[PDB]
Curated annotation (Swiss-Prot), chain A:
Stretches for region Heptad repeat 1: 1-48
Protein name: Spike protein S2'
Function field: Subunit of the fusion protein that is processed upon entry into the host cell. Mediates fusion of the virion and cellular membranes by functioning as a class I viral fusion protein. Contains a viral fusion peptide that is unmasked after S2 cleavage. This cleavage can occur at the cell membrane by host TMPRSS2 or during endocytosis by host CSTL. In either case, this triggers an extensive and irreversible conformational change that leads to fusion of the viral envelope with the cellular cytoplasmic membrane, releasing viral genomic RNA into the host cell cytoplasm.
Species this chain originates from: Severe acute respiratory syndrome coronavirus 2
Outcome (variant: D29N): In strain: Delta/B.1.617.2, Mu/B.1.621
Effect after changing Q33H: In strain: Omicron/BA.1, Omicron/BA.2, Omicron/BA.2.12.1, Omicron/BA.2.75, Omicron/BA.4, Omicron/BA.5, Omicron/BQ.1.1, Omicron/XBB.1.5, Omicron/EG.5.1
Gene that produces this protein: S
Amino acid sequence: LIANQFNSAIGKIQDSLSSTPSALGKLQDVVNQNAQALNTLVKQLSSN
Amino acid sequence: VKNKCVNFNFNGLTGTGVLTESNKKFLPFQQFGRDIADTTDAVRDPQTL
């Protein structure tokens, strides 16, 4: 019984991750913020 | 002179870099091309268009 519950839970984990697209936002936001900072720095070259 | 680091002076626009045959298709009323950081990255040769 414990073996079947464990295997079923792992399979539900992988296809739930495969379905929901907004799962990894904790990582993604980090990347976004860094890129966004660099972006503003570049356009500060175009100010008088 | 192309594919060499040269000092270019195109109609008073001054700079340093490598001139390369491009793939950008200018419209006939345009004579420059700028970057996000306001640096020219495409230019039209005033003698041979």
